[PDB]
Amino acid sequence: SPGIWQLDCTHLEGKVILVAVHVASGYIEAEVIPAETGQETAYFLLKLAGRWPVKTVHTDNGSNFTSTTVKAACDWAGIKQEDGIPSMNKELKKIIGQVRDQAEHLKTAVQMAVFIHNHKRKGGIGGYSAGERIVDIIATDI
Amino acid sequence: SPGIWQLDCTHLEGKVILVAVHVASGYIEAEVIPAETGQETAYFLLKLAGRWPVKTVHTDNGSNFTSTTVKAACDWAGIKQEESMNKELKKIIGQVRDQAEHLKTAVQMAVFIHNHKRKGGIGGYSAGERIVDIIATDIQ
Numbered sequence: 698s699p700g701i702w703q704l705d706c707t708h709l710e711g712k713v714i715l716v717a718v719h720v721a722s723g724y725i726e727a728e729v730i731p732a733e734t735g736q737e738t739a740y741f742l743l744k745l746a747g748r749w750p751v752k753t754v755h756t757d758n759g760s761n762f763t764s765t766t767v768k769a770a771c772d773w774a775g776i777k778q779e780d781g782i783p784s785m786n787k788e789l790k791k792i793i794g795q796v797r798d799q800a801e802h803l804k805t806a807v808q809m810a811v812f813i814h815n816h817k818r819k820g821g822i823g824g825y826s827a828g829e830r831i832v833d834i835i836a837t838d839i
Numbered sequence: 840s841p842g843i844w845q846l847d848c849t850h851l852e853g854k855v856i857l858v859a860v861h862v863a864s865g866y867i868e869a870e871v872i873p874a875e876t877g878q879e880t881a882y883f884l885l886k887l888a889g890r891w892p893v894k895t896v897h898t899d900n901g902s903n904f905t906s907t908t909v910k911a912a913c914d915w916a917g918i919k920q921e922e923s924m925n926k927e928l929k930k931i932i933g934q935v936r937d938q939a940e941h942l943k944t945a946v947q948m949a950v951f952i953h954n955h956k957r958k959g960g961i962g963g964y965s966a967g968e969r970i971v972d973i974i975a976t977d978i979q
């Protein structure tokens with residue numbers, strides 16, 4: 698449960714957003730990238746894995762993820778790929794829409810949407826944000 | 840304090856590596872940027888704050904930091920403005936540099952290596968363990 702991420706892509710304004718979701722908490726990492734190439738995907742994963750302890754990624758089995766470039770990055774990071782193995786994503790497009798007019802460029806609106814997402818309290822004033830849940834799940838001591 | 844980071848640039852192959860160190864843990868976040876512009880800095884600070892609860896960042900004197908874009912980004916994210924971990928990271932990028940085509944790749948490998956690495960004996964901890972433990976403890 699703590700090491701499992703789901704990667705998905707979304708296409709917005711003719712641009713591609715790569716989204717990684719930490720399945721257990723709802724916490725997200727996201728980046729606008731040039732196009733869905735093996736090198737861009739490898740580089741996103743290497744960055745994700747250097748920040749969070751990533752054991753397994755579930756992917757949509759796109760051509761970017763069957764490349765040897767991505768397989769190699771995953772081997773180097775000790776990440777197991779599960780390609781093709783099983784709509785928050787809609788609310789991210791929503792959030793991006795509600796910050797869009799404070800930033801000139803899509804990439805800035807994406808990072809603002811990431812911030813709002815990971816800070817939002819889910820389940821009422823009684824609840825926890827994704828950012829709070831992920832550290833809770835992942836922490837090894839107290 | 841759980842909320843305190845320090846940011847530093849190191850120049851290399853005619854680009855800039857922007858480094859933020861979570862002071863209490865030694866955990867590191869880093870990026871290779873074209874130059875130390877206010878726009879790059881502000882974008883970097885916004886990414887950091889969307890991922891970790893940043894309360895305060897300590898920085899050098901530079902013009903990037905008092906830029907209008909950086910003040911807007913700080914104000915929005917709720918961030919208040921104002922080394923051996925760095926010496927270590929520069930050492931690691933050196934030791935991996937040749938394993939990779941682009942600098943940005945060598946830098947991300949060094950960060951992975953740095954944040955995963957256990958310090959001390961059988962009962963020690965990595966920086967990525969310490970940051971998560973400090974924050975989780977603060978929440979409780």
Ligand SMILES: O=C(O)c1cc(F)cc2c1OCOC2
Binds near residue numbers: 817888889891974
């Ligand atoms: O909602 C929060 O305050 C929070 C707490 C964390 F420990 C870690 C993160 C948090 O949100 C920002 O993203 C990461």
